[PDB]
Structures are given as C-alpha cells and as structure tokens.
Amino acid sequence: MQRGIVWVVDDDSSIRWVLERALAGAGLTCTTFENGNEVLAALASKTPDVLLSDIRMPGMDGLALLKQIKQRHPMLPVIIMTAHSDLDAAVSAYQQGAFDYLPKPFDIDEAVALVERAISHYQE
C-alpha cells in the first residue's frame, strides 16, 4: 500500500472514479475533491505527493484557482486535466512552467503512469 497520492478536483462523477479506480488500480493513492475548497482546506495544512485538478474553476476555463494550488504546493509536479482548449491556460499561464496538463479526455492510465514517473522524478 501507499505509493503516490493524487487529489482529484472535478465537478463530475466519471473521472473521479476512473482516476480513483486507475490510481487505486495502478497501486497509487487518490482523493476525490470536487470542491477546490476542500482541496484548499485540505492542502492548506499539508500537501500530497501530487495533484490532479481539473477545470470547473473560473479563470476563463477554470485554471485561475491554480494560484491556490501553487500557493499551497508550489513545487508539486501537478499536471491537471484539460479539454485541449483548456490547456492554453495551463501551458501558457504559469511561472515555472513544468506541467503537461493531459489533453483530456485522455488515458487515465497514461496519467497515472505519469505520476508514477513524476512522483519519482520528483527526487531531483
């Protein structure tokens, strides 16, 4: 048990399960948080091994709240999900750009496998 954490932040009930399933299927941890607040009042006291928030938020598509993210975990190799048209705000709207906001929809497994490679590469 225990081998990577990922806080999901989606206002849907399809990816949260998939992610949680895949994450809990790939041998990784996951925490559904369809409430930026929760992930805010939860990451305001600590920080996981990584995050995987989605849009929902405002920031045009919902990538502004990111502030809190970075403000909470300004180092975590977060990727986050995007709908292609929600990547131009994730790819071109960050200080220390170093993400890969999967062009959701994508292969959760591919996203999970990534973390497993990001949670490790983190030791650099």
Structural domains of the chain, with CATH: 1-124 (3.40.50.2300)
Cis amide prior to 105 (ω within 30 degrees): yes
Provide the phi-psi class of 36: left if phi over 0, else alpha when psi is between -120 and 50, else beta.
alpha
Name every residue whose Cβ is closer than 8 Å to that of residue 6 and which is 6 or more positions away in sequence. Answer: 19, 23, 28, 29, 30, 31, 48, 49, 50, 51, 52, 112, 115
Alpha carbon distance 84, 23 (integer Å):
23
Write down the experimental method used for this entry: NMR
